[PDB]
C-alpha cells in the first residue's frame, strides 16, 4: 500500500519513487494493476534498516522483489516472514549468518557477494533459484548447492574452495566464476555443456583435461596459474577471448588453430616463436610482453591489430612492424632495438614505450604526429632531434611512464644539458633556437722608460722588443684571467739616444735616486708622445738609500695616467699594478674586431717578418684579400698593427718603396747608425754604413739612408758628409731631438764645421753679415742664442701637444 510506502519514507527520511523494473541500485517501488506493491529497493539505507522496516514489510503480502544492497547490515533475522519474495539483493554487507534465509520457499535470484558468509547450508531449501552471486566470501566448502538445480549463473569466486565436485550435480549453468580460490582439479567441470563464460583465474591448476568437453565457451580466463600445455585448447575454436597471462608455456602452435579470437593476453612466459600467430587476422589486442622471443616478422600479417605489448623481449629489428597501420599502443621497451625508422608509417600510434633499449637516433619518429605517449628512458641517446619538440606533449625527467608525456631518464644527453631537458619543452625549444642563432686581440706592448732595466729583466727570467706570455711573467701567472695575453717589452737608455717614435700600451717609468732630478723629462715624454697609456712609476735600488721616497701623491695628481701604481722595491706588487693597468678602457687588450682582421694581421706579420717592408700595392692586395678597401677600415687596421708594435707605419715616410716596416730590424738599424763612435765625433763617413752594420745589405743600406733623412734626424750636406746633431728660451722636458731638427738647415747660416754635438755656430749668408751660435744644455734644459732662428725653433717645436715653453 502507498500508505506503507509513505510510512517507510518518513521512517527513513528518503524519497522513494514510483519506478520500473527493479535494479540492484534502485531506491523506489513498483506497482501493479490495482496498485499493489511488489518490488521495493532500499539502496544504502543505513545499517539499522532491516530491524526497523520488517513490520511494514510484512504488512503488505504482495512484495516479491527486495533490494537491500550495500546497506552494511549484520543481522538478517527479520528476513524470515516475507515468504512472498522472488529476488533478493544483499551485496556488500557485513552478513555472517544466513540461517533466516530458510523459510523463503520462493526465490529465483540471490545476490550476496560483498558479505562475510561462511556457511551456505541454510539455503538448501531454496529450490527454484536461477542466479547466485557468492563471490569474495570466507566459504570453504560447497555441499548445499548440490541440491540446488536450475541454476544458470553462478559466482563462487574469492573464497577458500578446494573441492568443487558437487557442481557436477548442477547441470544447467551458463556462466561460472571460480577464481581466487585454492583449486587443483577441474575434473567435475566435464559434464557441463551449456557454459559460455568460464573464469578459472588464480589457482594451482596445471592440467586442463576436461575443458575439451566444453564447446560453447566464448570467454576463458586462465591466468596466474602453473599451466604448461595448451594443446587441449587446440580443438575449440569458438572463444572470442582467451586470456593466458603469467604461466610457464613454451609452445603456442595449438593457438594457431583459432581464427575468431579477438583479444589475446600472452604475458610472462617462455614462448620462443610467435609464428603460430600468423593466421589470426582478426586480433585487435595482443599482449606479448616479458617473454624470450626474437623475431617479429611473423606478426607482419595481422593488420587488424590495435594494441601491441611486446616489452621486455629479445627483439632487435622492428622493420617487419611497418605493415601494420591501425595501431594505437606499442609497448616494446626493455629490448635491444637500435633504429626506429620502420615506424614512421605508423600514422595511428597514440602511446609508445621504447625505453631500456640501445637506441641512439630518435629522428625517424617524426611524422607520427598522433603520439599521445612516448617513453625512451634508459637509452644511449646523444642528440635530440627537432621533431622531438614538435609533439603535443610536455617533457618530464621522471622515472614514471605516464601518458601524454615525453620522458627521459638515465640518458647521456651531451649536446642538450640534462638540466635544460628537465626544465621543460619550452626550455628545450629556447635552448635549441639559441643554438640555431666576435674575436678579441689579447695583446699589449710595454715600453720600459729609464734614464734598472736589467732589474725588470730579472722579472722576465734585452735590447727592447721581447715577447712574453702569462706563464712567462713571475707573480702574474696565478691569475687565469689573463692566461691568453701577449706582452711586448721594449726598453732603451742613454744620453743622445733619442727615438720618440721607434695608447695600446703600458709604460712603467723607472727611477733611481741619483736620476730623480731629471724626473719630469720622461713623465712629460709619456704625456706627449706614446698615447693615453696607463703609467706605472717604479723606484728601484732602494737598498742603497732605504730612507728615500718620492712624493708619489703630487706626481700622481699631476699625471692622471698613474692612479697610484707605485713600487719601492730593490733588486711583487709589480704584477698587481701591471694587471690593473692592462685592463683599462684607455688601453687595448680586449678589443672586439672581426676575425678577418686577425687573419689579415697574421698574413701581414708573415709577409713583414721576411720582406721587412711592404708596398702600398701589396698592402691593398692583402687588405682586399678579405675584401676590405675602406680607407678608414684599413687605416684602423694598420693603426692597431702599429700601436701594438708588430708592424710599424708612419704618415711621414713619403716613400713608395716602403709602406709599412718591421720594428725588429728597421729600428735596430737606426740604433746602429745613430751611434757607432764615428757619429760621436759628429760626422759620419760618405757611405761607410757597411762598416757600421755588417740580413742587411747595400740595398737595405740606402733604404735606411733614405729613411733616416726622412725621419728628420740628419742631413747629407755634401761629398758624403753627415751631421747627426744628436735668446734665452727655457723648456720643461727639453726635447732630445730639437738640435737635430734645428741643424737640418746646413746650407744656411754656418761658419765652418763648428758643432758641439750639443750646439753649433752660424754665419749669415743673407744681407749684411751676422755671426750666430745656438747651443744646448741638457743639465739645465735650456737653449742659448748668439748674435729666422726663432722661426725654425717654432717650426720644430710645433710638432708637440701642449708643450710648455719659457722665454727670457
Amino acid at each position: 500500500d502507498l500508505d506503507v510506502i509513505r510510512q517507510i519514507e518518513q521512517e527513513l527520511g528518503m524519497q522513494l519513487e514510483p519506478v520500473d523494473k527493479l535494479k540492484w541500485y534502485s531506491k523506489g517501488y513498483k506497482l501493479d494493476k490495482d496498485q499493489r506493491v511488489t518490488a521495493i529497493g532500499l539502496y544504502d539505507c543505513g545499517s539499522d534498516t532491516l530491524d526497523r522496516i520488517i513490520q511494514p514489510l510484512e504488512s503488505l503480502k504482495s512484495l516479491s522483489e527486495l533490494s537491500l544492497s550495500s546497506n552494511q547490515i549484520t543481522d538478517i533475522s527479520p528476513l524470515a516472514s516475507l515468504n512472498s519474495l522472488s529476488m533478493l539483493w544483499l551485496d556488500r554487507n557485513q552478513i555472517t549468518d544466513i540461517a533466516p534465509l530458510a523459510s523463503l520457499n520462493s526465490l529465483s535470484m540471490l545476490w550476496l557477494f560483498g558479505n562475510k558468509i561462511s556457511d551456505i547450508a541454510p539455503l538448501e531449501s531454496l529450490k527454484s533459484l536461477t542466479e547466485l552471486q557468492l563471490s569474495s566470501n570466507q566459504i570453504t566448502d560447497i555441499a548445499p548447492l548440490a541440491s540446488l538445480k536450475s541454476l544458470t549463473e553462478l559466482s563462487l569466486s574469492g573464497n577458500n574452495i578446494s573441492d568443487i565436485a558437487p557442481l557436477e550435480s548442477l547441470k544447467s549453468l551458463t556462466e561460472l566464476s571460480l577464481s581466487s580460490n585454492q583449486i587443483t582439479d577441474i575434473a567435475p567441470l566435464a559434464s557441463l555443456k551449456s557454459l559460455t563464460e568460464l573464469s578459472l583465474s588464480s589457482n594451482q591448476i596445471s592440467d586442463i583435461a576436461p575443458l575439451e568437453s566444453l564447446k560453447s565457451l566464448t570467454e576463458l580466463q586462465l591466468s596466474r596459474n602453473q599451466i604448461s600445455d595448451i594443446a587441449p585448447l587446440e580443438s575449440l575454436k569458438s572463444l572470442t577471448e582467451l586470456q593466458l597471462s603469467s604461466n610457464q608455456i613454451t609452445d603456442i602452435a595449438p593457438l594457431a588453430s583459432l581464427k575468431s579470437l579477438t583479444e589475446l593476453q600472452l604475458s610472462r612466459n617462455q614462448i620462443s616463436d610467435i609464428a603460430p600467430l600468423e593466421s589470426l587476422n582478426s586480433l585487435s589486442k595482443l599482449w606479448l610482453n616479458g617473454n624470450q622471443i626474437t623475431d617479429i616478422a611473423p606478426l607482419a600479417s595481422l593488420n587488424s591489430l590495435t594494441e601491441l605489448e611486446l616489452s621486455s623481449n629479445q627483439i632487435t629489428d622492428i622493420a617487419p612492424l611497418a605493415s601494420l597501420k591501425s595501431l594505437s599502443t606499442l609497448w616494446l621497451s626493455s629490448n635491444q632495438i637500435s633504429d626506429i625508422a620502420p615506424l614512421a608509417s605508423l600514422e595511428s600510434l597514440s602511446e609508445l614505450s621504447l625505453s631500456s633499449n640501445q637506441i641512439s637516433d630518435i629522428s625517424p619518429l617524426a611524422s607520427l604526429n598522433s603520439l599521445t605517449g612516448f617513453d625512451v628512458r634508459r637509452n644511449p641517446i646523444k642528440r635530440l632531434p627537432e621533431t622531438i619538440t614538435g609533439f603535443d606533449m610536455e617533457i618530464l625527467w621522471n622515472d614514471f611512464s605516464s601518458s601524454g608525456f615525453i620522458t627521459f631518464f638515465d640518458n647521456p644527453l651531451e649536446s642538450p644539458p640534462p638540466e635544460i631537458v628537465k626544465q621543460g619543452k619550452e626550455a628545450v625549444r629556447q635552448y635549441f633556437q639559441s643554438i640555431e642563432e666576435l674575436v678579441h686581440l689579447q695583446e699589449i706592448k710595454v715600453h720600459l722608460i729609464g734614464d734598472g732595466k736589467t732589474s725588470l729583466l730579472k722579472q722576465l727570467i734585452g735590447l727592447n722588443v721581447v715577447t712574453k706570455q702569462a706563464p712567462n711573467i713571475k707573480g702574474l701567472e696565478n691569475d687565469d684571467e689573463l692566461k691568453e695575453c701577449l706582452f711586448h717589452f721594449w726598453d732603451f737608455g742613454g744620453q743622445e739616444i733619442m727615438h720618440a717614435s721607434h695608447r695600446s700600451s703600458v709604460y712603467m717609468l723607472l727611477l733611481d735616486s741619483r736620476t730623480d732630478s731629471n724626473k719630469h723629462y720622461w713623465l712629460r715624454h709619456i704625456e706627449k708622445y706614446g698615447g693615453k697609456s696607463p703609467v706605472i712609476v717604479v723606484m728601484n735600488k732602494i737598498d742603497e738609500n732605504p730612507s728615500y721616497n718620492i712624493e708619489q701623491k703630487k706626481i700622481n695628481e699631476r699625471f692622471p695616467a698613474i692612479e697610484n701604481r707605485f713600487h719601492r722595491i730593490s733588486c711583487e706588487s709589480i704584477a698587481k699594478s701591471l694587471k690593473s693597468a692592462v685592463l683599462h678602457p684607455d688601453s687595448i687588450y680586449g678589443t672586439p674586431l672581426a676575425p678577418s682582421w686577425i687573419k689579415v694581421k697574421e698574413k701581414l706579420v708573415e709577409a713583414t717578418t721576411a720582406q721587412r717592408y711592404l708596398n702600398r700595392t701589396e698592402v691593398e692586395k692583402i687588405c682586399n684579400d678579405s675584401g676590405i678597401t675602406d680607407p678608414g677600415e684599413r687605416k684602423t687596421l694598420l693603426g692597431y698593427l702599429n700601436n701594438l708594435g708588430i708592424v710599424l707605419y708612419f704618415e711621414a715616410l713619403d716613400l713608395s718603396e716602403i709602406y709599412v716596416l718591421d720594428p725588429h730590424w728597421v729600428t735596430i738599424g737606426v740604433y746602429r747608425i745613430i751611434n757607432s763612435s764615428k757619429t760621436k765625433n759628429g760626422h759620419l763617413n760618405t757611405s761607410a754604413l757597411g762598416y757600421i752594420l755588417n740580413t742587411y745589405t747595400l740595398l737595405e743600406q740606402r733604404y735606411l739612408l733614405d729613411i733616416m733623412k726622412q725621419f728628420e734626424l740628419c742631413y747629407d750636406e755634401g761629398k758624403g758628409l753627415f751631421i747627426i746633431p744628436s735668446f734665452i728660451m727655457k723648456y720643461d722636458y727639453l726635447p732630445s731631438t730639437i738640435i737635430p731638427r734645428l741643424m737640418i738647415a746646413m746650407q744656411h747660416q754656418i761658419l765652418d764645421r763648428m758643432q758641439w754635438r750639443y750646439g753649433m755656430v752660424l754665419k749669415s749668408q743673407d744681407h749684411e753679415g751676422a755671426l750666430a751660435k745656438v747651443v744646448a744644455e741638457t743639465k739645465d734644459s735650456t737653449i742659448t742664442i748668439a748674435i729666422i732662428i726663432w722661426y725654425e725653433i717654432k717650426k720644430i717645436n710645433a710638432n708637440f701637444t701642449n708643450l710648455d715653453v719659457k722665454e727670457f
Partner: nanobody
Amino acid sequence: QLQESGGGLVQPGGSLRLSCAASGKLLSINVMGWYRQAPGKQRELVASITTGGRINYADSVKGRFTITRDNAKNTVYLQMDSLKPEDTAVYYCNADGIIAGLYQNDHWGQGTQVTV
C-alpha cells in the same frame, strides 16, 4: 581495467580534468574515485563517489577538487583547480566492481603524473 586520460605540468593556480573510463568488463561499480602518490609517501584517498550519489572527500582537498560521474558510461572526472605545489604527484583510479564474475573492492589504474 581503468584507462585514465589527462595529467601534465600546470602552473600553480591552474586547472586540470583527469578522466577515468572503466572497460566494459567491469560490471557493477558501486564506489569509484581518485587516489594519489607523492614521492616518498603513501596512497591516500582524494575522492570517492557512489552509484547512489554519496561523495567522500579527503578533508585536505575539500572545496578544491570536484568529482563527477556518469553511470550510463562508467566514467569519473576529477576537475582540479588552484593546484598548490604539494599536489605534484601521480594520481590513480580506484573502483569496486566485477570482472568475469569476480568482485574486488580495489581495482587500480596505471596512474598519471600531475606536476606543478
